[PDB]
Amino acid sequence: KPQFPGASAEFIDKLEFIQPNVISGIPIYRVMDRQGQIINPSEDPHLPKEKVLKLYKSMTLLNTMDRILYESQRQGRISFYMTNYGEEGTHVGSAAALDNTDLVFGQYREAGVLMYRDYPLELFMAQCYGNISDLGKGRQMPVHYGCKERHFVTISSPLATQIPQAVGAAYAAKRANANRVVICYFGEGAASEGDAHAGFNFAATLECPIIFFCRNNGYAISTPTSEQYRGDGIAARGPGYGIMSIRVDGNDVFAVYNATKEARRRAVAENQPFLIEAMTYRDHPISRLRHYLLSQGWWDEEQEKAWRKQSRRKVMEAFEQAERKPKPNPNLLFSDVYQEMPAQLRKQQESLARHLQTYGEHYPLDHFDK
Amino acid sequence: KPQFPGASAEFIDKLEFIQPNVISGIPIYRVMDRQGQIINPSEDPHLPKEKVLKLYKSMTLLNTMDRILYESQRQGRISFYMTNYGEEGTHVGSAAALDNTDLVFGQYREAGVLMYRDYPLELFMAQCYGNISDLGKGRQMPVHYGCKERHFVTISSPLATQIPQAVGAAYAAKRANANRVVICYFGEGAASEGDAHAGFNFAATLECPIIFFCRNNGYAISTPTSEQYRGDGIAARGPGYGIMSIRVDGNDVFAVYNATKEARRRAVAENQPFLIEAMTYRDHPISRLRHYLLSQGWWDEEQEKAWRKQSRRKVMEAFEQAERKPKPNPNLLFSDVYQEMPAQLRKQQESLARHLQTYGEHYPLDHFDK
Amino acid sequence: EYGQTQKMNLFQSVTSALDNSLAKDPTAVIFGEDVAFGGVFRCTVGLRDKYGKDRVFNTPLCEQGIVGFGIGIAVTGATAIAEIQFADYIFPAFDQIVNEAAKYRYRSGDLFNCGSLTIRSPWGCVGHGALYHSQSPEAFFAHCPGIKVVIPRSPFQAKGLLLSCIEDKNPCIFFEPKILYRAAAEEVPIEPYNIPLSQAEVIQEGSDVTLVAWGTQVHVIREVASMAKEKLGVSCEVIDLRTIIPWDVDTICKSVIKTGRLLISHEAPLTGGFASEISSTVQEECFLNLEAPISRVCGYDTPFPHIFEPFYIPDKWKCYDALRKMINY
Amino acid sequence: EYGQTQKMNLFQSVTSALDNSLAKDPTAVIFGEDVAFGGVFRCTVGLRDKYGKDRVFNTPLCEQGIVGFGIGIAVTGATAIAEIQFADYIFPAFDQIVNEAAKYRYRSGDLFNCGSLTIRSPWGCVGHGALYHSQSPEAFFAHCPGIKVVIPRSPFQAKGLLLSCIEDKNPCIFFEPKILYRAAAEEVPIEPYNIPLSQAEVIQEGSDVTLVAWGTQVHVIREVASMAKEKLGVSCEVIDLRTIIPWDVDTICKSVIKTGRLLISHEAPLTGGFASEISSTVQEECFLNLEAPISRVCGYDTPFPHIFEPFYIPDKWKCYDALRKMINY
């Protein structure tokens, strides 16, 4: 009987390498088929109509906003934009399964989480425009959203950095003892960074109530997953860290919802991490949910038309007000570097003010506040 | 049928998290029992006597050297020392299974690899003393060995950095097409660093002929493995990267030998990575091999006595010559920063020479060359 | 001035600082490699038994994780005191520090912050640490707006400065000169107290030349001042910089306006070292007062060597000879 | 002078440099995120089709891995040209660069080296890159003996400098000013050529003031010189530093001895920026020649902002106003 502290195991008397099973991987959990039909009645969450309609309206409203801001980017009205196409169901379905005060870390494809938590169109827009309504003060590139009120930690561009941070926040929540989970979104690309390894391992050994939500769409920019990893996706990594793992159909809001609801329930009760890998495309979550609504009698062509019209108008009202707002005062380039402003930073602020008094005609001052 | 580029998998219609199996982990491969008896005749490598005696003499000679240098450290004659206790069989058994020109990366517990490749006692000693015979020029802390002639890449103190480097060297070897493997040693502690994740994944996706050799002794300084990870050791991580993996009894030179011989054979032929996790203690490899030798008629008490005496004398001859050598010229603090010496670095070298002409009585100049 | 004191060496004054913080702040936790049993330099001895295993705990061996983890704790408002085992091993966390911690508040418009984070780390040479147990990384961090870098010269200074870091509402790196951990003890107040950040201390007044240093190197320049006075009749003003960024430009400039001469010394390599920032700034503010060129007596531009350490460090003879030349310019 | 030329913008001159290297060095490989299809800035277009998928290839998304991997290739003697996608994302690799690459040769007594490694990376501001698409990290690397840091101002300069990096027997970081990638083309020789490392270039001779900069900022100071001449009657010597470390101290000092005045400019933040190293060095060597304080016109000590970029950069008006004050001192 083996006496090694590092591992709990029998002896074996024959040489045998462990082979990965990548050809038949962790199967993909699905609740509804491509026609919006429930496959297995015992798995139906039976979400009420009001809630299912809110999922549908959040996904479509996001998609409307994507269309417009993507065009805005194309004309150089905004400098950058990441869309949410194919990712609407992973984000709205997972968000619906959280408590509203569960803390969210993510990156570029998580606008749907905010949309579900009713973040105003005005504030999505203010950030992309860097205008005076932006609580981010116009400091970051577009789509770098954050909302303290809606427990959505500000996005930063370096990939995977939020993963070990999300673990620290989950640990602090555990100690604070008020029944909260953290969720942390990242793509399959970002899962290759050393920080993913750091976060997964810390969550397991420190026993943190965290959901890791990996969006696997098969691509990181131009890099197919065949160049990204050789195991069975991200889900097969979870068990090697001691993490409970599942793979789900990212086009199925109900599958995403079910897996997130159950991961949240068990993460908070047991203080242990859960890994969800949602398979998406770089057959669509919106049209699948649409088919489901129709079979229930809960949507029709007329409501679809009226909703496309109303959501286009809401987005265009926001878009135009966002474009017409001034940018923040250029003084705001100097605040919040530290909480207080160091005397030497204030001196740099004063030198800018002095500079703009002599040379101001050469700066775009008329677009900026004060 | 699922159409996702990220993973090859069926659908499943029921919610089921994948649970890690840590209670019954990857079993531990063993060739000989604690009494030096072969358990399974078909697994016996039947190494010839000359070779098995060289394994035994390398392990014991290492252990002799450890005893003396450990005492040297205790008296402050050398400033630092890492021993090899419990690690003699993992290192000598794996080294014996390599070709002599296979390139080795490791860290603190790999002196046995060098001992097996006949690195002179004089050079082990010269490095710990930083004397004139050191090819390292006395620049690094003791036990930071390197030998270009014996394909043993110089050790550096930051843990795990050599793992992605070993992968790059394996890739370059693949392209050079002359049938060489790289082996990369690291502890279970170092396997938590982001660089381990980097190296494992790059090896699999870039198809590198590399053996990852993880020594799992249950401790990283004061940290038990229960604080280091929650999966089934390091071996259970391999499959999640697409890497062929095995766990072996680190106290069994024959098990270590067999697994390394087979990993080398398949790494070089297939250009793919192999992970070996050798379980050790922080029942001993030397005494187990000793029992084996006796059952063969290949060793006895008289030879054991004569060998303890001769190896103690060889080590003491080296130790005393090492202590009596001068240290290198202090000019060598400035060379090899770049290949050539930048004009400004040469100016700093000249300022030191000038300084030592006026203030030399205050420096320990009499111990240093020129 | 500060109530009851007892004799403490540098490591004990750190433990005292950390004890006082945990006692008064229920959210505070301490974590890193090997901190549970007391740490490899004994700075956390007794804290886990006293405060509980959920407040004083070991992490996996992963510096980028330790820092990322500390940031996430601080994001919720809880005090996170992270340890990195040697300053030489802070580099894996460099992206977490520079791109994440330093920018957390700015980039969010102050919606989120990790101000309640402090990273402590043993620092500086130790006689035989060679390349990876000797480093002084402070100049790497000085070029990153949004973090504070603080380095004490003694036990009394260390406890007061560490308490300020821990309570400061910005992410702080506190570098502890490991050669002083077991060096001479001094009297250190038992109860908490603070020493202000971004404030240099004139430890000895002088009229001919300003000497500036931080950490162990403060003791070296104190000795240099003593050698100058005795051998040369020269009166040195000795200044402990204490905070690397944001640094106390006023105290240094006011001293140089009085003396007209400046020598800055640090163990870190000359090129890119923090002495160049001090020198170029004092040159700008005190140009007309400068009697001689500002002198920088630093480590050589090489990695930190094992057997050649005695010849590498900017010791008192190196500093004294530069001061002598500067006085004769 | 150099044989047949054709018009190339900065990205095409990089491709030309990389093509010439692969053609003449059978060991050379190029790797990083998204390099196979040509790269996100098009610097590797056509190379994989021309040289093969085993020489021009994508890595997993992991910067510390890319650099570690490149070091291991170079350890065998093969040329490794690694790409980091934005200089802002070089920080995960900081430990691989600073503790490993820079020290590889020294610490082994030259038994091993990774001199055949070059890391290229887009660098500098771009109008709208904000915090993580704008950075100029060169001062972080200037404090690390054992690496070379090189930054071109143009297509002609970029190809000659990149070829020198790639062939240099030390690990090199080559920072490519991404705002110039698609900017104006110039004539660039088709066949390989070298521009020496650690050599500044006086691009315009002057007698009143020395201006020093690197990258895009060279074009800014050229314009400043033109404004000074026209508005002030002032004659500027304009210097492209080109190599950050080891830097060309002699050319800068010889110019300042002639002019007696120096203004250094760079996009990176003032504190800890590389201008402080140049300033403190020239102050030491040209103390007696200095008519006015060395002036540093740098980015502010903040993270790089999105909407406020126009007010952040050390533009020609900022530089000109400082020059004006310096001329009047």
Ligand SMILES: Cc1ncc(C[n+]2csc(CCOP(=O)(O)OP(=O)(O)O)c2C)c(N)n1
């Ligand atoms: C540390 C770092 N490296 C590189 C980048 C450049 N980059 C921005 S998105 C991206 C691909 C991310 O892929 P994945 O994580 O799969 O997310 P997806 O875009 O598919 O949703 C890359 C390489 C970055 N932002 N940060």
Ligand SMILES: Cc1ncc(C[n+]2csc(CCOP(=O)(O)OP(=O)(O)O)c2C)c(N)n1
């Ligand atoms: C990057 C880094 N962090 C920390 C250390 C300090 N350190 C030296 S050995 C060690 C434990 C290593 O444990 P493991 O990898 O299990 O090897 P073992 O000592 O058990 O053989 C640590 C934390 C180091 N050298 N490098």
Ligand SMILES: [Cl-]
């Ligand atoms: Cl990006």
Ligand SMILES: [Cl-]
């Ligand atoms: Cl160590």
Ligand SMILES: [K+]
């Ligand atoms: K991020």
Ligand SMILES: [K+]
């Ligand atoms: K190492």
Ligand SMILES: [K+]
């Ligand atoms: K703090």
Ligand SMILES: [K+]
């Ligand atoms: K090179």
Ligand SMILES: [Mn+2]
């Ligand atoms: Mn992806």
Ligand SMILES: [Mn+2]
């Ligand atoms: Mn171990």
